[PDB]
């Protein structure tokens, strides 16, 4: 259960280690869209804000 598109919900994640490799390997999502940053890059890249 999640909020509507008009009432979009934003959650700050901090002080945790983030890996997108597991999410990409599963490939559960039918489509993947990346613009400013890209998936292969997310694994090596370190992001201050999630």
């Amino acid at each position: 259960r999640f909020a509507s598109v008009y009432a979009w919900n934003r959650k700050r994640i901090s002080n945790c280690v983030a890996d997108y490799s597991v999410l990409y390997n599963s490939a559960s999502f039918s489509t993947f869209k990346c613009y400013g940053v890209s998936p292969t890059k997310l694994n090596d890249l370190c992001f201050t804000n999630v």
Partner: protein, 49 residues
């Protein structure tokens, strides 16, 4: 010569012009030039090759 550095000012101005040209190149690196980031490394880290 001791009282006024203006006589050697033209020689200093030529050195200043060379320094200004090097400074301009440093400023150019800061300029985005239409790229998302001025730094080449920042673009490489966040984007596919």
């Amino acid at each position: 010569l001791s009282s006024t550095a203006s006589a050697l000012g033209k020689l200093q101005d030529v050195v200043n012009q060379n320094a200004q040209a090097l400074n301009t190149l440093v400023k150019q690196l800061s300029s985005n030039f239409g790229a998302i980031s001025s730094v080449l490394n920042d673009i490489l880290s966040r984007l596919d090759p």
